[PDB]
Write an enzyme that holds these catalytic residues in place. Sequence first.
Site, mmCIF file in Angstrom:
data_model
loop_
_atom_site.group_PDB
_atom_site.id
_atom_site.type_symbol
_atom_site.label_atom_id
_atom_site.label_comp_id
_atom_site.label_asym_id
_atom_site.label_seq_id
_atom_site.Cartn_x
_atom_site.Cartn_y
_atom_site.Cartn_z
ATOM 1 N N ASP A 35 37.346 47.612 48.441
ATOM 2 C CA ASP A 35 38.397 48.560 48.099
ATOM 3 C C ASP A 35 39.765 48.044 48.553
ATOM 4 O OD1 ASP A 35 39.948 50.736 47.568
ATOM 5 O OD2 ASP A 35 39.142 51.998 49.161
ATOM 6 N N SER A 199 55.002 46.690 37.677
ATOM 7 C CA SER A 199 54.770 46.222 36.325
ATOM 8 C C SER A 199 56.067 46.306 35.530
ATOM 9 C CB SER A 199 53.670 47.065 35.670
ATOM 10 O OG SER A 199 53.524 46.774 34.296
#
Length: 330
Positions: A35, A199
């Site tokens: 994770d 992004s």
Amino acid sequence: STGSATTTPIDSLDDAYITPVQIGTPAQTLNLDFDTGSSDLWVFSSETTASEVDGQTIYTPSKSTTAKLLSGATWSISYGDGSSSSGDVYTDTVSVGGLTVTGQAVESAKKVSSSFTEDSTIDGLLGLAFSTLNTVSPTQQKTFFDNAKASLDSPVFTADLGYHAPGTYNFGFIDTTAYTGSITYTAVSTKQGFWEWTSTGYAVGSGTFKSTSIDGIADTGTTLLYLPATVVSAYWAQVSGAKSSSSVGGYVFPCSATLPSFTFGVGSARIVIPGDYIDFGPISTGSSSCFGGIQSSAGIGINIFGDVALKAAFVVFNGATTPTLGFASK
């Protein structure tokens, strides 16, 4: 040194991925959920409340000659999906794919929430976010990667998750055969303890690319792709019959649909998520309403590039002095 381990979807939907991890001496192999959005290595154990164990493999520290109680240390964690666990702490030898760390903090669960109990395939979590998020008190502990880093050939790990198929976590090297083209690297903020990046935009299907900054985290422990409501609405508007369902808890779509792809930007590069990666199947057995793999982050407080996004790429988690993230197509 290096390590290399195969990671395997837990079910036919890729709801999560499990990776075998050797703990203790002799080795006890547990299948952990790696994770990159958390920083605790915790396991089901011989200390876990018996009624809360249902099929998991447990770590028994008393059977490990290298286990030592970390005196006075406790831990307690709550995840974004509302699940939680807590317990005490041992140090022991932990190996992943041939890479060994001695003195790793292994957090032994005394209690786990129902979602963990109900998932027989996940024996615990191995956190790969920054150690500043580790919950051990009163002395915070280091992640497996943080402990291994100085010994690695290069201070990196890579995630290569499969779509409906096994994939690979590598430590200490970049497998140049595992991706196509080049890896595009992008800046990381560690301010919130995550692999947080920005992004450069998105496209839906064959549509034009929208240049827009989307700050979010690369999180292998989250199944879906969580993005701003504007982006998510633009995606689902291209699927006839799709709608946001408050009763179901997100966007659903007719199971008869053909889903468009979703592209996200990494600098000037582009990662394309095929439409089929966005299908999470019937909302309930036999239903013709299917659950979407792109959902709104509104009210999470952060955008999350979870498995839906990451499995479309070869992803480098670069733990150099100034960390960065790399993405390649594959």
